[PDB]
Design a protein around this ligand. Sequence first.
Ligand code: NA
Ligand code: NA
Lengths: 310, 317
Amino acid sequence: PCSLIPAKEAFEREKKIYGKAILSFDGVNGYDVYNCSIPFTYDGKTYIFGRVEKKDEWVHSNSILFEKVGENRYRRHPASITYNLEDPFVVKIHGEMVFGGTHVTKNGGKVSDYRCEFYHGTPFNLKYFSSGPSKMKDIRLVELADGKIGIFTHFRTEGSCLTGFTTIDKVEDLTVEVINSAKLINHRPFGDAWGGPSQVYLLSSGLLGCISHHGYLLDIQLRIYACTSFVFDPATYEVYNFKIIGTKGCFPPCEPKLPHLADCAFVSGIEMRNDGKCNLYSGIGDVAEGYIVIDYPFEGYGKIVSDVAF
Amino acid sequence: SHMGLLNTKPCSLIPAKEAFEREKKIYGKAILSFDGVNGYDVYNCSIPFTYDGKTYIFGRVEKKDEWVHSNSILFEKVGENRYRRHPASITYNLEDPFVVKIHGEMVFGGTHVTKNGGKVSDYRCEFYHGTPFNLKYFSSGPSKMKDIRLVELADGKIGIFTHFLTGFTTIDKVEDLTVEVINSAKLINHRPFGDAWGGPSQVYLLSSGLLGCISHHGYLLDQKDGIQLRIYACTSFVFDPATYEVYNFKIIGTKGCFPPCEPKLPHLADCAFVSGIEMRNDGKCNLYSGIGDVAEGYIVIDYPFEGYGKIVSDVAF
Ligand code: NA
Ligand code: NA
C-alpha cells in the first residue's frame, strides 16, 4: 500500500487553507487553461504561461503567455509567440528566463515520443537551445547559491520512477548526456509515489525547496495526483520534510477533463505573500488553474531567495 | 570537367540554369513587406491562401543575425505586397512552412528542429490539419527528412512526395500519414534531375489527372578566387502517379530574377527557395520564393505546366 496514502488522508483531514480561487483566462476562444508556470514579473507587469487545450481534445495543447489584467484575471498577450508545448515552466538563471515545456511527437495521430524543450532569453524574446532525452518529462532547473545550475531529472522509461540531480556551469551546457548521467537522489522519502518537482527554489540556507507533483494508485484503483514539497541538500543528495501541501479537493470545485482525473492536481509552484503565507498555484482536473493560501512549506529550512522578477 | 580542378564533377543542372538566365521570360517582380514581427526577416513562405474573405500567408520568421531561431507565423494581407502578423493565430516552432488542401481542410507542415546544448541534433517535418486558425498536430515524418509534400489526387486518395532521391506513395486519409508509409515510398524517375539535390515545394492537381510539381533544385558552385555558393533555383516538373514518370523538368526562377537583396550570408547570393505559384487572371502565374534566406518575393512567369492541363486544386479555404 502506498506510503503517501496515510500522509494524504491525514492532510485531507487536518490542512490549514486560508483562501482559494480559480483563475480566469481571456483571449483563447474559451479553451481550457491549466498546468501553468508560476506567475512572474517583467517590465512592471505580471505574466503567466498557460497550457491551452480544448476541453474535448486530448494531446492538442499549446503554451501561451498571459498578462494579468485584473484580480485573478489573465489575457493572452498578443505580442508573444506561442510554443507547441504542454506543461510550461519558468525559472531565472544568471539574470535571464529559462522557459521549458513538453514537445509531443505523433505518428499518424498516436503519441510516439515526447521530450522537454528549453528556451532562454527575456520573456518576449525566448530562444530555443536544447531538448532533454526521449520520454523524460520532469526536468527542472535552479541557480544554486554558488552560481552553478542545478538540474532535477526523472528516470521513468524502464518501469521505475527515480529522481536524479546534476549541475552545469552555463545553461547552454544542458545536454542529453549531462541529464542521462545525473546521480540518483535519496528517493526513499517519496516511498512508491511517482512524480517530481514543478518549481525549485534556492533557500537562504543554500538548500533547495522543491514544489512537486506526486501520484499514486489507491485501492480496482484510484489515480491520486497531489501537490507535495520536499527540501533537497545538493551537498549530500539527501531529501527532507517530504509532505502533501494540497489536493484537488482544496481548490474550488471544477469538473475534471474525464472522471478518472477527479483527484488530479498538477502543481505550478508557490508565490510568497506579505503575510508570510504563500499562494500555491496548481493545474486542477486537467481543466483549470487555481491557487490555495497555505503556510510556507519550507519553514525551518530558510526563506526563498530565488526570484522570477525579470 | 568544364571547371577543371575547381570541381571535377560539376552539377548536371548548371547548363539548364545558365540557359534559363539567358532565355527567361519575366513579366514583373516584387518583394513582399511584413509588419508585426519587430523588423525580423520573413522568408521561405507558404503560398498565399484565402480564408473567410481574406488572403493569408505563413512566413518563416528569424532575426537577420540569428541562425536556427525560426518560428512560423500567419500573416494577413494588408495591401498590395504587404502582410501583417495576424494576432489571433498561434505560432509554430518550425522552419519553412507549407500548406495544401486535403479532403476539404488545410494540411500545414514545417520543419521542427531539435538541439543538444545549442547544436542541431535532429529535425523532422511536423504536420497539422484543420481550418487555418484551428490547426491540430497529428504526425511527424522520419528523422532528417525535410521535403515531404502532400496533394489530393484525381481519385480522392492522398499523394505523398518523400526525399531520401524522390519517392511517391498514397494513403486514404490524412491520419494514416506515418513514418512507416513515408519510408516505404517507391522511388520516382530521377533521370531528369541528374545529380542536382532538392524536391517538390508545392504540388497541384491538373485537369489531365497529372500532378504539377513546383520544386527546388540546387548544387554547390565553387568559385575561382571566390567563395562556394549554395545554389537553389525554382524548378517545375509534371508527374504521372500511375507510372512514376517525370515530364517537362525545367528551371522557372532564380534569385537574380527577383528584386535585389543582400543574402543572410554570402554563400546564399544565388539561393531562391521556392514557395509556389498562384494563377493570374491574364493566364500567367506569380511565382513566390524565399530569396537569400532574408526575404520573400514573386516574379511573373508563363504557366509552367502549359500543355499538361489547368490547375484544378485550390487553396480557397
Ligand atoms: Na493513424
Ligand atoms: Na553547449
